[PDB]
Write a protein that binds this ligand. Structure first.
Ligand code: BCL
Ligand code: BCL
Ligand code: BCL
Ligand code: BCL
Ligand SMILES: CC[C@H]1c2cc3[nH]c4c(c3C)C(=O)[C@H](C(=O)OC)c4c3nc(cc4[nH]c(cc(n2)[C@@H]1C)c(C(C)=O)c4C)[C@@H](C)[C@@H]3CCC(=O)OC/C=C(\C)CCC[C@H](C)CCC[C@H](C)CCCC(C)C
Ligand SMILES: CC[C@H]1c2cc3[nH]c4c(c3C)C(=O)[C@H](C(=O)OC)c4c3nc(cc4[nH]c(cc(n2)[C@@H]1C)c(C(C)=O)c4C)[C@@H](C)[C@@H]3CCC(=O)OC/C=C(\C)CCC[C@H](C)CCC[C@H](C)CCCC(C)C
Ligand SMILES: CC(C)=CCC/C(C)=C/CC/C(C)=C\CC/C(C)=C\CC/C(C)=C/CC/C(C)=C/CC/C(C)=C/CC/C(C)=C/CC1=C(C)C(=O)c2ccccc2C1=O
Ligand SMILES: COC1=C(OC)C(=O)C(C/C=C(\C)CC/C=C(\C)CC/C=C(\C)CC/C=C(\C)CC/C=C(\C)CC/C=C(\C)CC/C=C(\C)CCC=C(C)C)=C(C)C1=O
Ligand SMILES: COC(C)(C)C/C=C/C(C)=C/C=C/C(C)=C/C=C/C(C)=C/C=C\C=C(C)\C=C\C=C(C)\C=C\C=C(C)\C=C\CC(C)(C)OC
Ligand code: HEM
Ligand code: HEM
Ligand SMILES: [Ba+2]
Ligand SMILES: [Ba+2]
Ligand SMILES: [Ba+2]
Ligand SMILES: [Ba+2]
Ligand SMILES: [Ba+2]
Ligand SMILES: [Fe+3]
Lengths: 258, 60, 40, 318, 280, 317, 60, 40
């Protein structure tokens, strides 16, 4: 007998090998997925007083330490984060219900206006100088030949009212680019940051539109504990406020439509 | 068969502009849909030619 | 919906009469369509 | 309305940056920078400087040799009529040694140029590999690129070198030409009984679609959180921000689970490396292990039956 | 259940349609009006794919009927039905299932939309999704329409749709020569390259050799500039990758849209316009 | 531009070939379908000829083929062969003036051989030609030289230092694709192996080369193009080698390949010595036959018009 | 079938530029569309050869 | 819609007469087409 066809050939067993390595892979990636946001929040944990920490399958991976350059620290993941109150109240006491923000929605710091507490220190260049700084601090930087200089354009909110005018431009010392617009606010002549991501240009007009917030809201932009640099904490606090206007800045972004 | 009508109040709950385009759009779509359905069926009026099929005005 | 109780009396009026106008054109075209070529 | 972060609408310059300093041994850097207002419209406007060591120069060298053999051969094939060369270029190519030769080094006029271009190309590719590892070490970083490049090199080697040798025939390697190499692909599938029923090529296809899905999703995400400096993935990875939070949550509310700013790059990495790794496996088995994938799939009961509504009697059997 | 930093964002509102009616969560999925519609379209769709597997092409007792995962297949009606609704048991089922799939995808997209509105993030994801939805539509709606019949759509079956792709492709003799095809393939490939490079970079910097600290933006740029004399930069690579993937889907949609309706001859022949220019 | 480019409008004519959903379908241009139909028009028959008369071989001097024909019928056959092969030239094309019986001019020794070529065709290859059969016209089309006759080609130039790629060029032979540009000599003249697909899933019993696969692919492209159709016309591309999943046209094509091997080998090559240089290619090989010659881009020559049944003189015995 | 003479107020609800360009786009689309729709049916007006076939009998 | 009540009577007037003009060109062409080649 020189013909006993074997039913299992190298392709079968190699597809088997694949699937096994695959399963181990999937599991592993799902473990890296829980280095943040975990263990979850249920009323299972609170009902049980905590004896039910929510983690699911697979489980959480041993902490990993990131050693920040420049006397920066040591970060871990997963870590234990202190709970933080919610600046809102349950739309329903029933589970899975959303919460309505407490007070003036843009002030709430809840919803599209929420944000975490990032360090109260600055991101740094390789050298260790504040990465994000204004062009006034970053002497060297310069507009690109043929690009309207933002400096001096008018910042205008979502309803067409002037907000202020661009008093300067913040830039990345690590990856040369416009990160922030500075706004000398009209209504109180105080200085605020405006993320580039929220700013639209109107070059022929030398304007800088903002669908995000209303001209007035520019008055409440979170502020810098120092005008020649900004902290990680402050970047989040700045952007999130503007983000809030996306759902709050009008009594209509709230939805529905019909 | 109850008493209160006054179904005008309907525009106090549903935004009129959006209702407007909603209806306009729906009508255009329903129009193309129905057009497609009848032309793809027997009541078709194109694949005919009156008074005579015209690509049979030329056997040549 | 930023309407007054009367601007829901007014709007409702133009809306209904207009919708009925549409339904009217509709009966015209369906009438013509049936005359030239009954579908049932 | 709101900016989409597609086009830098207003750019800024600073003196070019020659970069982080390499330790002793990593030679100087050459060339002096320039800025392209248009690249700048969409990305870092800085063009270079570049590093060129023994490795890098020896690779540029081998690689250009290989490109010359392929090209010169193509001009030769239309008789040095550069017009004709221009006309049929898409169809021009350097075919491999014929089978009569097996794995022997063949005469110039019969494929020996292909073996020389194949030789030099591979060497130049693997030298570019080493290059990227050196370039990756001088910076204290890890070898993630090098492990992926090593995966793509794996597939390459599987295509033109490993399978041919195993099959005992340089004619089985792929020929250098645009349309010619398209034909090699099609003929390849035909010869081995429809490559669609080859499972490994299905997975590699799932991973290619997947590299498109993942980069599309992640990229769309990162731009959508580009208002929170989400592109700055490094610090969102060390000091999680509302960018990485809104990002992870968008997906959480849509499909029920999510990853993190650091981990999505692991899903992406592994999925790309997977295309090339299933792909090479797929070619490895063609002819060496399985000769007719449609048949293989029938043997494992995966091939569908349809009502046989059209059929033809086999003349070989009359 | 929520992430450990999620409650602070679970705001109310943002719908397009529904308002507080379906404005709630279930586990980790957000519901919303389009999720309810979506779940309906999806469930009925799948449940029908289940009935098709149950009945088979010749009836539940026939040898062609099957529950084998590789072979179950629901195919469109014959061309003889043109754009009409065909009987349920003659490709009708496939038509309905299609309506459900299209509706589920469009619902899904709109639900990601309500979700962007909630979180205050850009709408890049559902826009990008809409390219796959577009691709799906040419493959089931546009093309078969331009071609006077829904039967030109691909069947819903794991390998049967592979067979579909195969014979439609081979009707043009050598599909590889389709120029839009060549484009789309290049984008799918390039996408695969950028993805592998970005992945590698981030993982190579946020996790360096033991003994080194988290790397920097300066490292990032210095590396790809060292190797290939250019670094498109962090932001932009997220921009490019999105370009590559969306374009890959685009050119796939156009590469198949032109295969029939705008080109009936074999595809290599197309390239004739190039061998016949009055330059040669 | 980078012009754009080469394109048809919607909707194409379409035909379902296989089972629904399997993807076996065909698309075509209506315009070009009507023009092709007008260009592949058949010549009407000559009135049938009476008789009832003596056999041709009794009244003529050199009649070696069309023997058993009545005088009348023979005469009819001559009028058809005249308009069919060389109407601008008339009778004198294949005859020595004043002498109908002479073979002193080559176009007649050839005409003779082609009377046996058509007769053989209509009577012995029905598994191929069915009841349509062939006629002089099929290839000649009012021309002395079939417009679509072929010759073995040498490709473009190569210096003496290197040998030809055998494939890799712009060739309308192989549908513009880059495969090998003369897939005819080894398949439509000689009878090399077309088969490369293995009949076993695992390997160790199929020596077919990838190269052989490309040659089969090129040839197939030729075939497809000559009859003007796609693979779904004969195959089910999930299994090109699977005969049960193919269409009865694969069967027909199988017998046709053999038929062209017979036309080119025992009817055309032998006439190479009495034919002029004007009818010969660079290797001395003569213009011969292929599928295109007869089909001229249509699945059935002249859209399957039935010409031969009106001329009994084109059938054996 | 008569004009509610307060149908000017429609332009207090629907933006004039958007309604206008909407009409232009919708119309140009329908137009290009229909032209092909008819050209795809028996009523073709291009491919007829009027009053004489324009090319030749063939290449000649 | 940033119009006055004074300028939507004016706009509506212009819109109506212009639209009707369009419909006129349309009815004309449909008439010439029907004459040269009736379609029903
Ligand atoms: C055998 C079948 C018959 C046929 C039977 C019917 C029937 C039956 C009907 C139509 C209807 C219509 N047909 Mg037809 N139709 C046929 C063949 C055609 C052909 C063609 C190429 O052959 C075309 C182009 C059309 C096109 C049309 C459209 C004009 C119209 C529906 C449009 C719509 O949805 O409203 C979109 C929605 C809108 C609001 C736009 C309405 C536009 C019209 C012209 C009125 C303009 C009023 C304007 C909107 C007022 C705005 C207010 C100002 C802002 C102040 N038909 C065949 C021959 N057709 C419908 C119709 O016209 O209703 C009377 C209808 O009931
Ligand atoms: C593009 C031209 C053809 C096509 C070409 C191919 C090719 C070629 C292949 C596939 C493959 C597959 N295709 Mg496909 N495919 C097309 C359109 C579709 C559509 C659709 C409705 O538009 C769907 C749902 C699928 C889905 C699938 C899966 C059956 C399979 C692997 C997908 C994958 O990993 O990709 C990447 C996506 C992901 C990883 C996301 C993960 C989601 C999973 C994988 C998809 C689940 C599908 C599920 C099993 C059945 C559908 C849901 C049922 C309704 C319940 N294709 C078009 C019609 N497809 C591969 C295969 O192996 O099949 C044999 C393969 O080789
Ligand atoms: C044509 C008939 C078959 C076909 C036959 C094949 C064959 C044969 C192959 C594929 C291959 C692939 N096919 Mg396929 N394929 C078909 C239908 C499809 C369909 C579809 C929708 O139907 C899809 C999505 C795919 C998708 C894929 C990819 C997933 C896969 C490998 C991708 C890749 O990038 O590797 C390409 C990447 C590399 C090769 C590495 C590149 C790195 C090198 C070193 C770069 C060097 C650069 C150079 C030095 C620069 C200098 C330039 C010099 C000029 C050279 N195929 C049909 C069914 N397919 C592969 C496969 O699956 O095998 C199992 C393969 O080889
Ligand atoms: C068979 C002979 C021809 C061939 C014929 C064809 C034909 C025919 C086609 C392709 C198609 C394509 N081919 Mg091909 N192709 C060939 C050779 C190749 C080769 C190669 C290496 O040689 C490659 C790389 C490719 C690759 C490609 C891609 C460019 C493209 C498909 C992209 C796509 O579908 O996107 C679109 C993505 C989608 C449609 C998915 C949409 C997602 C929807 C909205 C969501 C689905 C959700 C679903 C429910 C998920 C299930 C999850 C479960 C619920 C959990 N082909 C051979 C030579 N190829 C297809 C194309 O052109 O593009 C369409 C096509 O029609
Ligand atoms: C998951 C696998 C995917 C992938 C990954 C991948 N590709 C990679 C890598 C990785 C990880 C690298 O590290 C490497 C890279 O460098 O990335 C930018 C690379 C690479 N992928 C590339 C190509 C590539 N990868 C592909 C595919 C894939 N790669 C998969 C999608 C493809 C396909 C199939 O489409 C291609 C075409 C190259 C850019 C690069 C390898 C380049 C290389 O090996 O170089 C060899 C030598 C030369 C090319 C000679 C240099 C020619 C110069 C341009 C001439 C300059 C002349 C100069 C002015 C000097 C003057 C001359 C003197 C002699 C006078
Ligand atoms: C366009 C660029 C790339 C892309 C983009 C893209 N896709 C996306 C997104 C984006 C940006 C999302 O945000 C969205 C998502 O949720 O992320 C996972 C999505 C998505 N990408 C997915 C699939 C997908 N994308 C693909 C491809 C692509 N998508 C491109 C490569 C592919 C392929 C074929 O390669 C697939 C398979 C889904 C997981 C998800 C959308 C899922 C969804 O919308 O869920 C609702 C619908 C259901 C749950 C099922 C409905 C049930 C139906 C009635 C039955 C289905 C019938 C079906 C037609 C039969 C097919 C049978 C198969 C065996 C062939
Ligand atoms: C009858 C009736 C009442 C029904 C009963 C209900 C039933 C049956 C319940 C069963 C419950 C369960 C088990 C099933 C529910 C099934 C549902 C509805 C369908 C699943 C839908 C869905 C889309 C699944 C697709 C899964 C796959 C693999 C998708 C491909 C995408 C992918 C590779 C996923 C993993 C990676 C992800 C999620 C990346 C997202 C992601 C990206 C992309 C970032 O860029 C990013 C940046 C910074 C921080 C975070 C992120 C981030 O999380
Ligand atoms: C951490 O961050 C990172 C960096 O930052 C530091 C890096 O620098 C880097 C280094 C990155 C690089 C060097 C980038 C390398 C990119 C490569 C190699 C890609 C190769 C691309 C090319 C050669 C160019 C190809 C493209 C063209 C020539 C343009 C052609 C235009 C065409 C065809 C017509 C355009 C029109 C269409 C496509 C039709 C419709 C398309 C759409 C609708 C798409 C929509 C797109 C968007 C973006 C919204 C990485 C990896 C990184 O991860
Ligand atoms: C006129 O032109 C001038 C400028 C001279 C130059 C022009 C050059 C041009 C224009 C060249 C154009 C080239 C093109 C377009 C090339 C395209 C090539 C393509 C598309 C190739 C596709 C696939 C090819 C592959 C996968 C090749 C694989 C080959 C391999 C893996 C060979 C391996 C061989 C080895 C390792 C050799 C070993 C030799 C040993 C040591 C074994 O010998 C004993
Ligand atoms: C109207 C014009 C023509 C007339 C009147 C005509 C007449 C004849 C006659 C009377 C014969 C018998 C002469 C003999 O064998 O002694 C004959 C034989 C023959 N003619 Fe013709 N002829 C015509 C055109 C052609 C043409 C155009 C061809 C070739 C294309 C042709 C090929 C032949 C051949 C080969 C023979 C020998 C027949 C055999 O062996 O069966 N003739 N012709
Ligand atoms: C360009 C696309 C086409 C391709 C790629 C193709 C490919 C092939 C291949 C690979 C084979 C060999 C199968 C085996 O090894 O058993 C084959 C055989 C065959 N094909 Fe084709 N084909 C095409 C078009 C056609 C067309 C249009 C016809 C008919 C007119 C046709 C008729 C045949 C026949 C009869 C055989 C059997 C030949 C024999 O056994 O000697 N093919 N084809
Ligand atoms: Ba009709
Ligand atoms: Ba006409
Ligand atoms: Ba010329
Ligand atoms: Ba065709
Ligand atoms: Ba003309
Ligand atoms: Fe990223």
């Amino acid at each position: 007998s020189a013909g006993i066809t074997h039913y299992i050939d190298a392709a079968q067993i190699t597809i088997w090998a694949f699937w096994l390595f695959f399963f181990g892979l999937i599991i592993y990636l799902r473990r890296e997925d829980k280095r943040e946001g975990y263990p979850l929040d249920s009323d299972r944990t609170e009902r049980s007083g905590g004896r039910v920490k929510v983690v699911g399958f697979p489980d959480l991976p041993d902490p990993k330490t990131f050693v920040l350059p420049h006397n920066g620290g040591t970060v871990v993941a997963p870590r234990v984060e202190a709970p933080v109150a919610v600046n809102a109240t349950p739309f329903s006491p029933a589970p899975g219900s959303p919460l309505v923000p407490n007070g003036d929605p843009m002030l709430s710091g809840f919803g599209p206006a929420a944000s975490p507490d990032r360090p109260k220190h600055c991101d740094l260049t390789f050298e260790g100088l504040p990465k994000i700084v204004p062009m006034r601090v970053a002497k060297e930087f310069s507009i690109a030949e043929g690009d309207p200089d933002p400096r001096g354009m008018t910042v205008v909110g979502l309803d067409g009212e002037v907000a202020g005018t661009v008093s300067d431009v913040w830039v990345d010392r690590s990856e040369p680019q416009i990160r922030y617009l500075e706004v000398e606010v009209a209504a109180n002549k105080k200085k605020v940051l405006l993320p580039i991501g929220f700013s639209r240009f109107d070059k022929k007009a030398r304007k800088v539109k903002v669908d995000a917030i209303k001209a007035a809201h520019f008055a409440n932009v979170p502020t810098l504990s120092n005008p020649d640099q900004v902290t990680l904490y402050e970047e989040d606090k700045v952007c999130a406020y503007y983000a809030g206007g996306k759902l709050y800045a009008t009594a209509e972004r709230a939805g529905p439509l019909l | 068969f109850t008493m209160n009508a006054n179904l005008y109040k309907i525009w106090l709950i549903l935004d009129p502009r959006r209702v407007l385009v909603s209806i306009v759009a729906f009508q255009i779509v329903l129009g193309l849909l129905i057009h497609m359905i009848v032309l793809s069926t027997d009541l078709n009026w194109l694949d005919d030619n009156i008074p005579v099929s015209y690509q049979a005005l030329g056997k040549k | 919906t930023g309407l007054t109780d009367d601007e829901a009396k007014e709007f409702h009026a133009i809306f209904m009469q207009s919708m009925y106008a549409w339904f009217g054109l509709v009966v015209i075209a369906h009438l013509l369509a049936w005359l030239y070529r009954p579908w049932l | 309305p709101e900016y989409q972060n597609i086009f830098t609408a207003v750019q800024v310059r600073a003196p070019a940056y020659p970069g982080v300093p390499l330790p002793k041994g990593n030679l100087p850097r050459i060339g002096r920078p320039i800025f392209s207002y248009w690249l700048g419209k969409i990305g870092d406007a800085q063009i270079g400087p570049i590093y060129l060591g023994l490795t890098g120069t020896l690779s540029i060298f081998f690689g250009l040799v290989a490109i010359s053999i392929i090209g010169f051969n193509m001009l030769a094939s239309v008789h040095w009529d550069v017009f004709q060369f221009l006309k049929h270029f898409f169809w021009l190519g350097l075919e491999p040694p014929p089978p009569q030769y097996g794995l022997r080094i063949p005469p110039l006029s019969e494929g020996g140029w292909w073996l020389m271009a194949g030789l030099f190309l591979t060497l130049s590719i693997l030298l570019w590999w080493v290059r990227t590892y050196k370039r990756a070490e001088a910076l204290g970083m890890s070898q993630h690129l090098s492990w992926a490049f090593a995966a793509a090199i794996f597939f390459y080697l599987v295509l033109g070198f490993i399978r041919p040798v195993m099959m005992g025939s340089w004619a089985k390697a792929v020929p250098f030409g645009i349309f010619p190499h398209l034909d090699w692909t099609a003929a390849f599938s035909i010869r081995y009984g429809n490559l669609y029923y080859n499972p490994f090529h299905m997975l590699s296809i799932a991973f290619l679609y997947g590299s498109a899905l993942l980069f599309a999703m992640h990229g769309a995400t990162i731009l959508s959180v580009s208002r929170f400096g989400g592109d700055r993935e490094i610090d969102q990875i060390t000091h999680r921000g509302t960018a990485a939070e809104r990002a992870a949550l968008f997906w959480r509310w849509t499909m029920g689970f999510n990853v993190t700013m650091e981990s999505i790059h692991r899903w992406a990495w592994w999925c790309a490396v997977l295309t090339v790794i299933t792909a090479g496996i797929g070619i490895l088995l063609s002819g060496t292990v399985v000769d007719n994938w449609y048949l293989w799939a029938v043997k494992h009961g995966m091939a569908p039956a349809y009502p046989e509504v059209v059929t033809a009697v086999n003349p070989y059997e009359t | 259940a929520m992430l450990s930093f999620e409650k602070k964002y679970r705001v109310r509102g943002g719908t397009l349609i529904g308002g507080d009616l379906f404005d709630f969560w279930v586990g980790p999925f957000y519901v919303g009006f389009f999720g309810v519609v979506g779940f309906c379209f999806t469930l009925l769709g799948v449940l029908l794919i289940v009935w098709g597997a149950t009945i088979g092409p010749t009836g539940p007792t026939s040898d062609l009927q099957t529950y084998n995962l590789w072979r179950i297949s629901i195919a469109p009606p014959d061309l003889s039905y043109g754009l009409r609704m065909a009987p349920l048991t003659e490709g009708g089922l496939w038509q309905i299932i299609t309506i459900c799939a299209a509706g589920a995808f469009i619902s899904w997209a709109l639900r990601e939309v309500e979700i962007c509105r909630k979180l205050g993030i850009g709408f890049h994801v559902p826009f990008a999704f809409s390219f796959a939805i577009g691709a799906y539509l040419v493959l089931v709606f546009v093309r078969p329409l331009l071609m006077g019949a829904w039967g030109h759509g691909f069947p819903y079956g794991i390998l049967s749709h592979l067979d579909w792709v195969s014979n439609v492709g081979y009707q043009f003799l050598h599909f590889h020569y389709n120029p839009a095809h060549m484009l789309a393939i290049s984008f799918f490939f390039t996408n695969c390259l950028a993805l592998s490079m970005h992945g590698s970079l981030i993982l190579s910097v946020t996790n360096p050799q033991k003994g080194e600290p988290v790397k920097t933006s300066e490292h990032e740029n210095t590396f790809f500039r060292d190797i290939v004399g250019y670094s498109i930069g962090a932001l932009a690579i997220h921009r490019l990758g999105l370009f590559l993937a969306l374009s890959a889907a685009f050119w796939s949609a156009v590469c198949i849209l032109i295969s029939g309706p705008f080109w009936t001859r074999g595809w290599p022949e197309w390239w004739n316009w190039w061998l016949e220019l009055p330059l040669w | 531009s980078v012009m754009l480019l080469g394109c048809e409008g919607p909707p194409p004519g379409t035909e379902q070939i296989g089972y629904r959903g399997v993807g076996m379908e065909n698309y075509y241009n209506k315009r070009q379908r009507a023009l092709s139909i007008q260009a592949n028009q058949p010549v009407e028959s000559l009135p049938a000829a009476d008789s009832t008369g003596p056999k041709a071989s009794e009244v003529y001097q050199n009649v070696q083929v069309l023997k058993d024909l009545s005088v009348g019928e023979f005469t009819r056959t001559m009028v058809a062969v005249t308009t069919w092969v060389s109407p601008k030239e008339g009778c004198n094309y294949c005859h020595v003036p004043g002498n109908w019986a002479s073979d002193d001019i080559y176009t007649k020794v050839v005409s003779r051989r082609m009377f046996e070529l058509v007769r053989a065709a209509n009577s012995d290859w029905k598994a191929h030609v069915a009841e349509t059969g062939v006629t002089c016209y099929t290839c000649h089309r009012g021309n002395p030289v079939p417009k679509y006759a072929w010759v073995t080609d040498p490709g473009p130039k190569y210096p003496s230092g290197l040998k030809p790629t055998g494939q890799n060029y712009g060739s309308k032979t192989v549908a513009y694709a880059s495969l090998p540009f003369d897939p005819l000599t080894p398949f439509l003249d000689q009878a090399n192996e077309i088969r490369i697909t293995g009949n076993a899933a695992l390997a160790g019993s199929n020596p077919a080369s990838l190269k052989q696969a490309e040659w089969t692919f090129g040839l197939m492209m030729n075939i497809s193009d000559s009859l003007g159709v796609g693979c779904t016309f004969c195959h089910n591309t999930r299994a090109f080698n699977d005969w049960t999943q193919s269409t009865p046209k694969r069967t027909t094509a199988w017998y046709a390949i053999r038929h062209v091997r017979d036309i080119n080998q025992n009817y055309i090559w032998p006439l190479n010595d009495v034919l002029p240089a004007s009818r010969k290619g660079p290797y001395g090989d003569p213009l011969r036959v292929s599928c295109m010659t007869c089909h001229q881009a249509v699945n059935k020559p002249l859209y399957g018009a039935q010409m031969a049944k009106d001329y009994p003189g084109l059938y054996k015995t």
